[PDB]
Structure formats: structure tokens, C-alpha cells
Amino acid sequence: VIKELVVSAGESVQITLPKNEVQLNAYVLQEPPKGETYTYDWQLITHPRDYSGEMEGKHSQILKLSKLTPGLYEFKVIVEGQNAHGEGYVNVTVKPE
Amino acid sequence: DGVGNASGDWHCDSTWMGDRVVTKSTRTWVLPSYNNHQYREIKSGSVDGSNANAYFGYSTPWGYFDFNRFHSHWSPRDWQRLINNYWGFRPRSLRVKIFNIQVKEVTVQDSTTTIANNLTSTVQVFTDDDYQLPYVVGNGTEGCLPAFPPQVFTLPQYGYATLNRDNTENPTERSSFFCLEYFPSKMLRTGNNFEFTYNFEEVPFHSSFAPSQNLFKLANPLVDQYLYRFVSTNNTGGVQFNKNLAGRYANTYKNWFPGPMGRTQGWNLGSGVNRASVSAFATTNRMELEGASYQVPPQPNGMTNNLQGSNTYALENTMIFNSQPANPGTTATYLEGNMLITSESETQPVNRVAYNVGGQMATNNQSSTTAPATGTYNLQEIVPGSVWMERDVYLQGPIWAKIPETGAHFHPSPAMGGFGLKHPPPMMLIKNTPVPGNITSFSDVPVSSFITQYSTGQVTVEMEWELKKENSKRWNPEIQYTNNYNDPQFVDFAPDSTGEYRTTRPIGTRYLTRPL
Amino acid sequence: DGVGNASGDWHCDSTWMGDRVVTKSTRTWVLPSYNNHQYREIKSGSVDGSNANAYFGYSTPWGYFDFNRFHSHWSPRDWQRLINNYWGFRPRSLRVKIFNIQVKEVTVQDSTTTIANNLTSTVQVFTDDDYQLPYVVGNGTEGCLPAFPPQVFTLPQYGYATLNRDNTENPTERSSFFCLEYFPSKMLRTGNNFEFTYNFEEVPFHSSFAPSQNLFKLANPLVDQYLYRFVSTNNTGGVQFNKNLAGRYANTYKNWFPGPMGRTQGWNLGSGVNRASVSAFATTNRMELEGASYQVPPQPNGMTNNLQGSNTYALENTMIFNSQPANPGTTATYLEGNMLITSESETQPVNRVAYNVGGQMATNNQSSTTAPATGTYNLQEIVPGSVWMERDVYLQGPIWAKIPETGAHFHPSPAMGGFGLKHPPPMMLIKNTPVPGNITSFSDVPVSSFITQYSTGQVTVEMEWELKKENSKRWNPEIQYTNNYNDPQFVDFAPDSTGEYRTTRPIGTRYLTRPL
16 A cells, blocks of 8 residues: 655646756655655656657656757656655646747 | 467568558557446536537447558558559458467455466457447547557457437437347457458549649640630620630639538648637537537548648648557647648649638629629539549558448548448457456346456458559659658657657658649 | 367357247356355245245255246347247257356465466266256246346356155155266366257247237127027016127127136236235235145236236236346345336236136026026136136246146146246256365365365357247237337446446237237
């Protein structure tokens, strides 16, 4: 039995070219103790057709993201703890010029 | 024959043999035990404010095989060798063969999901070759064989929507129920296999050539016609006539006419000067059928979006694929950069564009008092002497469709493209047989506790295609599907560092060119 | 042949071939190890205050196959196509085939019930085709094949009640014990199967037609009889006579007479003006047999409940099915809305109603002093020249019954409806062979610790039915079983959102009409 948690950071982000370089946080509810270590898992589930790929899973709170062609980006983040397991989504919508 | 012997080999190839190509394709499938082995009653009312979405129907535990897309049989190189060399193609035969069945059994005990295989559990497969079931294959649904051969796909659950009542979720007395265990099905252990052959009926070749010549410009521009046109009237009411000159195609006499039309809205891609913040539902072309009104994309054959090199498309008229398969039931707002928005620009010498009016006709009778007046129409149906082009088939699009068993029909080219079949390939249904759990006493109520289990295995599909050979005395080179990318960051129609199959652009068939 | 090969396929279909229909049906069954592999002595005294319920008998670990209901072979559409097109039907042959045996073994260790299969354990099946066992099949008991093909049913435990002594639980010296391992049975592993064929004896067709004409109204109402009736006496004792007129059917001379009768109580369904708070046990028709008195529903053939469009039924005379199978041993007080209370109104031109007196006969000898007097009788048995109709068979009701091996009988139509068979289909008994546990020493007492285990598998039953074709010169259309529901909230004879098989109404056979 593994318990649950809350992932909430947005879900629109709505960035626009040329300023495509964005990073996504990993706000956790509720307040974790200082001993419990979290493991993260960022996975790209949708991306534009001309997307190159420089997003590989950092397993960390910071997700760097570069070379964004305009379109819709969806990231399935998986928050895994010692006795806690939650997940969240984020829609990055990059607009053209 | 038994558990320690392979019940079939991996056939996945293509063999071009003159004006004929066989295309074999083996895939690996997973079959979940859908519905926990029972028939259910799926029904809905008006969602999204539209009672068109209200249905009544039944969902079965049966899964099915849907190899009704072109990439399930064709690699993109063998598709390129087809659409750059041949004027036509049509299927001739078919050979499906399910093999290497193995059925696991998941046993979640104290959150330790042990997955072992039972050698004794069976799998039912029948094929519906009398066409007695609702044929749900040729409708543009998911669950197909993948484009890429080492991908493992899950078999889609078989459901069907029967007649509801008064655009509600309630049935009518004509609403039927088809039990699928009332059909004889072959029980398959782990050493058994299921073969099946099929011969396609006589269909026309798909015209995989673009026109080299406009429809209203079929005369030569050198000699002029022996027919005159009414040009004007004099100061009296006396009519006047002029000879149709040589290259004046705007006022020559025409012998053939374009296809059907219904004017759809044209939206600008690329840069775009589109109307901002449009809820595009209330202004689409609908076709009200027995109560509610339905969006009907794409509109029937005989039109085109996208003239040539213009960023205006008729998005109601087109086939919009995604680049990758998506999660089911998603409400994501995709953009232009995600989709494969697919142009029909190659057929513009014969078809009329869907975001423009097709012509104009006289609205009144003229006189010395009333001047002549014309009025533009937004839709024109079949006129005798018409000629249009069928919808282009794509590598990512459907192969066939079933004509509905009604009384009559007019020439059954499916609006989504492909081959209209009266007797299509029969729908191969498949399920896991229910294995009961621990039942220690007799009760007249049926068993509802089962061993939770899934099965997996391979399926091979061997189609055969008769091809129409290109024969043209055109001098200059043609346009063909070349692999033209400027600074590729990835090989297209091939995986990436993640390992997912990356497609960027849809591939048509009309690349050869041919005069009318 | 082995564990990795299917030992039979799923046959479940029907093939109408002229005046003949084969009906195949495969079901999946579960066999618990009943009694923990031993013979027991079930016995009881007077429960519910009645010593009729006192029995002595034996309960075996054997389970059995009971395909003695009509829905086990007939879909409701193939039943509809039968009862609206044919005047009769009877079984001809039978073919039972048990296959895909697999035997699990439950091992509850620290409340973790692991269920694995042993490849080595066997299953005994024999068929009792010399009729040496107590035939318990044709008695309206549960444990049948389900109506709906993807339902998995558990096999009923085989018991039988022998002769008790003096309406107690104690046996008499004529009470027998049949060991069922003293019959030769085929041992079946997981790669073996059990086939069995059977040919039904010569039985009459079931008369699946309603009468078009009353029994006492068979003359024409145009010409009158050449026979006179005693009408009255004059002021002296001189008799007087009148001619039987043309349409006066109340006093014509009759040539044929209705069937048997025993007056049962008639209770009002629907609205109802029934007597409130009736314990309906003490006033039923009983038939006292060798000591105790037994309720005998339904009463023997030749009557009917429910005249026509009236809500009064004879509930002692009818067959009351439930809508769904119920849990065993339930003491629930069901109401009218739960049950399938099944009418015999179609046979009222020939049969007499069971909640009315059948006639009256003269009680005294008249004179100049004593006037003539008649008295109504409540029961009349077989009179020579009688004609009645047999009990209607239903989709939810039994197919056959065994005539008891006594000396003599009068024409053996079963009271519950169906086909009275002298040599019925033999009772297919089946059990799991006992696998002993850990026995480490020799003891002369037999083993009582076994590996707890169950087996499961499929069984197919292929009956064959000779049909009597309809041939009538009736002009107007007939009544037929139509699918007539006003605002259906669910499709009937089809599942629901829960997935349970929903039946609402029983389906007869008498829908065609035929003159006497």
C-alpha cells in the first residue's frame, strides 16, 4: 500500500516564441518532512512534429526545456516517495510569432 | 502443436512482383479482459450541448483486429516506391493468421502483482463473414496495428451503438442486441493458431495521379471553336453573338463539369489572418439526420481545400491526423504544429474549392424593365456530365469502409477516402475465455468472480495489391515524394533517442501526373 | 491430446434446415469438490409443520449436467422464429461433449489463497444410460445451463431421496443406496474429452398452436340439428321436446368433451380484490400419498388459469418463474413485480378453467312429489371422448421428464409441461477425483485429508429438433410474439449496465392459430 499526494504547479504556462526557454517547478502538497526524499519522473507525452528533443528526464525538481517549436507540450510528472505517490500534468502551449 | 513449439513464424516483408505486391506484416498484441467478462449497456445523453452525441449501445468483452490503415501494411519506403511509380492500386486478397497465443494471469496478493502464465486457458476467435454484426472497423477509430513493426498494441474493445429513442439515451423497440457468443468461435490454447483467407471484390483502382490539365481548359489554345456565344444586346432588344476564340477558356463551350460542392469555411494556417476567438462549433456544415444535427467532416467527394501554395485551408473538409498516438479521452487543445493537416491541392484542376462559391445562376427573367441578375450558390449536387476526383488515400489513413446495408446508394466512394466495399474484410473478434475463481457452493446466479487474466500473441496480415502501371509520354521530370528536409534534427519515419516512432508529414498518392 | 492443445472448440449456433433445426450451445462450468469427497446421509423431519417434507436420502460428491430447460439451447430470437412459424416441434437427437478440462488447486496459506492448476489431476465422467440411478434431472431444479452464453454456471450437487419410514427421517428396509463409483467412468485429464450421443424416442409433437374455435361451438350457426332436446313437461307428466336450433350452442348435442379438472383457488393479480392476510398453505389442493399430504402444483393437464384479459389467475395451476436466478435457500417474500406469472389463456376453447365449477349433474330422481335438482362438482377425471390440450412449454421451462418406472400409467404428459420420456437423456454425472494430502504412515482408516481443489471446463450440447410446418388457409394476420415495449428503459433478453441478463416476460409457444 502506497499513499498519495498533490501535484499543482500549472497547467498553463502559456509561453510564446522567441522566448521559448522555460523551466517547470514541482510544488508538493502537503509539507514534506526533511527526511523523506522524493523521486520525480518527467515524461513528454505530446510534442509538435518538428520537435528535436532536449528534455530528457532529469528526475529532479527543475525541468530544463529547449529548442521549442510552437505547439502543445504535455508533461506527465510522477512524484514518488517512501510511502507517498502522486502525479500531475502541465500544458505548455508555445505560440508562434 | 504443443506448448514447447512455435505455432507460426514472423512474416513481415513486401515482395514487388511486376504489377502486384504482397505486403506481409506481423505485429504483437495484448488483449485485456474487457468488462470483466460481461455485456454492458453503454448509453449517453446530450454532452457538449448537442443531442447528436446521445447514443444507446452495448459494450462487449470481445476485442477485435483493426488492420484498416495503410501504414499497418506499408513501410514508408514501400509506400514511396508505390506512389512515385504507379497510377493505381487496389487490394486483391488478404490472409490473416493469429499465432503464438499465450495467456498470463495477474495475481495481486499484498500489492505484489505476480504475472504467470496458465497453459490451460483458452482464447476464442471468430470472424464475422456473413456480416451479421455491426461492422465498426471502417470508421476512423483507434486500436489499429502500429505503423512501426516492433510496437506492441492493445486490442480495442468491441462496442456498437444501436438505435436510441428521440435523441435520448433510452432505446427504441427496434434497438437490437447481438450476443457474440452465439457465433461459433475457435477455441485457441497456447499451441493452436487461427488462419483466415479473404478475396476482395471487384473495386476500381484508386486514381493515384494528379491531373496535368485543367477541366475547363481541355481545348487547344490555337484553333477556335465553331460555336458562338451570346455576348450582348444592342440598343433594341436584338441579341448579338461573338465567336469563341482560341484560348479564351472563360467563355468557351464546356463538355464536362466539376463535382459536387458544399461551401465550407476556410481558415488560414501558417501566418493566418483568422478571426480571433472563434468557437468553431456553431457555424460548421451540419447534416441533420432523424432529429439531431451532426457535423459531417469531411464533406462528400468532389471538392478540395487548399488551392496551391496558399495558407487557407478548409478545415471542415480535411483529414487531420496527429503526429503521434494520443492518450484516450484527452481534451487537449492541439495546435498547427502538432497535427498533420493534409492537403488536397493536387486535385484542383478537376474539383472546386470548398471555401469559394461554385458559380452563379440567373435569378429573374429579364425584360425591357428588369435587368438580368445572377445569384451565387453555395452548394451544387450531382449534375449529369459531372467529373470529380476521389479522396486521396494516405499512409496514415483508412483502407476501406463498408457500404451501409440500406436499399440504394450513389457511387460508394467513402468520404474519408479509400475503397468502398460491399463485403469488406470480416471483423476478427477475439476474447479471453472466463476462468472462474474459487466457487465452493451452487447458486443459480451466474459466476461474477473470475481469475483476472490477459492474453498476448502475434498476428500476421498478408495483403495483396494489384497495381496500375504508369505509362506516359511526358518529357520533363515529375514531382515525386523525395526525402527533403532542411537541417534534420532527426530521421523522419524512424525512432528517436526516446525510441518513439517519429512521423512529421502525411504522404499522399497523387504524385504522378496525367492528362485528362 | 496434451496440455498445450485445445481439446475442442466453441460451438454455439443454430442452423434452421427446412423442417429441422440443430441448436448447439457451449457453456463454461465450475465443479466444486462437493462433500469433501464422501457420501453423506441427508435426512429431515417435518419442517414447516408438514411431514411431507420429511425425507431420507444420500448426497454424493458427484455433480451433474442439467441442460433440461429450453433457454439452454434456444436464443430468444430463434425461439421467436420457432413459435411464430411452426405448429409443432420435438427433439430427435442429442450430442453432449465435455472438453477443455482444467483443474485448479486452492491452497489457503496464511489467508493468501493461491490458485494454481495441477496438470496431473483427473476428472471422472460417466453417463447413466441403463437408468439405474435415481433420475433427478426432470424435476424443475436449479443448476441448469444459463440462458445467456457467456455466463459461467456451477454444477449442481447430485443427491436423491429414497424411501423414508412413517414420514420420519429414518429409513425403511427398502431404502437403497447407489454408490456412483460402482459405475464405469472415463478418467479425464486436461487433454482428454468426453463425447456422448443420444437419439430420442418417438414422442408426439408439442402442439404449439392455439385453437381458432371453441370446443362446444363446432357446429355451424346456420343449419340446425336433426336432434331434439327435452325442454319441459306439461301440466301432466308428459315430456316435451324442442328442435336444437342453429347457433344455440348452449343446448346442442355435443360430440367431444373437455379434459380433466380439479377446482383450484383463483387469486386476483394486477389491481386485485383478494382476501387480505391469507396464509395460503392450509387451503391448497393436496394429494395425500402414503401417509403425508403434498401440495401438487401444477395440477394435471386439462385445465387453465386466466380466461382472457382478466386479472384472476389460479396460482396453484400455474408455473411461476423468477426474472433472475436467486440465491439458494432464500426465504424472501417475492411480489407480483418480481415473478414471471405465466398464463395458459390460449387453451381456453378446449380446457376448463380451474377457479370455476365444471358442470352439474342430477342429484335425485324426480317424481310428482320431488322436483329435479342438480349439484355442481369441483372435479371430473377422464371421460371417454374427452379432448384437452397439453401444458404449454416456455423458453424458461423444462424440456423433458422421465416417466416413473412403475407398472402402468395413463398418457404421460408431464404436468410441468414438456415431453414425457420413458428413456430420457442419460444423466451425465461428474466429479473431481480425490487427491490425498500429506499421508506419512499406514492406517486402515481411509484418507480424510485431501488437496482441496475444483475443476472447470466447457461443455457443448447439440440438440436436433423435428418441426411441424404451419399450413393454414386463414386469411387475416395472426397474433405473433412481437417485441412490444412502451418506452423501454432497457433492452429485454439482453444485459444491462450491471451486466446481468435481463428477462421480463415468459414466452409461450401457442401463437399460431388452428381450427379444431
